[PDB]
Each structure stands twice: as C-alpha cells, then as structure tokens.
Symmetry: C3
Subunit: 79 residues, 3 copies
C-alpha cells in the first residue's frame, strides 16, 4: 500500500497545482479584459493581492510535490 499511496497522493498534488494555476489564468484573462476595455486603483490592488495569494499557493503545492517525489523515489530505491 505504501508506495502506490505515495504515487496516487502526488497525483493529487499535481492536480491541485493545475487547479491553482487555472485560477491564476482567469486572473490574467481578467486583467487583459480590463485593459482592452480602456483608473480603478482599489480594484487593481485587490488583483495584485490575489495574484500573490495564488502564486504563493502554487509554489507551496510545487514544493509539496517536490517533497513527495523524493519520498516516492526514496521508497522505490531499496524497498
């Protein structure tokens, strides 16, 4: 159970990173639509905050995925 659990669990990390990256894509699509339609300083500050919130989350999911890769490989070698 132990090794296949680590493999399936890393597949969820990669999926979570894909989901988080997809939301970051919608934020970039939103920004392109605003500029094409053209001011709102308060709105663009919130946009910057959400870009950072999801950037920090993606890097956390990338780090967690890197940590699981090392554990899955450690388990494969000599197990």
């Amino acid at each position: 159970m132990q090794l296949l659990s680590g493999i399936e669990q890393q597949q969820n990390n990669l999926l979570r990173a894909i989901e988080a990256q997809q939301h970051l894509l919608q934020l970039t699509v939103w920004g392109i639509k605003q500029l094409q339609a053209r001011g709102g300083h308060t709105t663009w500050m919130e946009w910057d905050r959400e870009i950072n919130n999801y950037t920090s989350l993606i890097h956390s999911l990338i780090e967690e995925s890197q940590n699981q890769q090392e554990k899955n490989e450690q388990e494969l070698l000599g197990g």
Copy 2:
C-alpha cells in the same frame, strides 16, 4: 493491471490538462501583444470564444482527473 492502469491513465489526464492550459497561455500572450501594439471587435469576440472553449475543456479535464483520483484511491483501499 487494474490499479496501475488507473494510475497511468490519470497521468494522461493531467498531461491533457497541462496541454490545454498551455494553449490558454498562448491566448493570454496573444492578448497582451495586441494591447502593447496599441478596435477589432470581431477579433476580440473570437478571442473570448476561444478563452471559454479552452476554459470549459480544462474544467472538464480537471473533473475527469478528480473522478479518476477517487477511483484509484477506492481501488487501493480494500483491494
């Protein structure tokens, strides 16, 4: 065969989502180049349609990846 098939098959779903997200990236890169070069209402309507077409596809691939994760985990537990 059954469990490793479900694992390999979910790796293809994640890859398909990465491929679909990559094409959505080129659409956002295209939009940034248009604004930097500056009108074309018909062209930006087609751009919005392709943003939605690939957004709907990515969510379909994310949902399919979530469905396979549950099936792979169900199979691991008690199998």
Copy 3:
C-alpha cells in the same frame, strides 16, 4: 522496479512542466502590469524572447511526458 520507476519519473516531467508553465504565468502577469502602468522596445524584445524560451521548454517537457506515457503503457501491456 522498472514500471514504477517509469511512473514516478513521468510525475517529475509533469511537475517540471507545471514549474515551467508557472514561470510563463509570471511573464504574462509582468506584461499586464506594464500595460496597466501605461515605449520600451528593448525590454519588450527580451520579454518576447523569454516567452519563446519557456514556450519551447514547455513543449519539450510535454513531448517528453508523451514519450514516457507510451513507454509506461507499453510496459504495462504484456509485462
């Protein structure tokens, strides 16, 4: 060892593609911030070069991930 090695190794390819796509996201976020703040021809040429450098890398990682999927599936079938 052979099959699970190919599965774990493809998980690293997908993670490398996610990492490369994430850097391409920051380049698109950078471009949106420049236009919102508004000229710099030399800077936008370097931006285009880095968009292509990471686009070429992502497609290389997508191709490598597609090559590993076929090898993992070949190994599963009749092994």
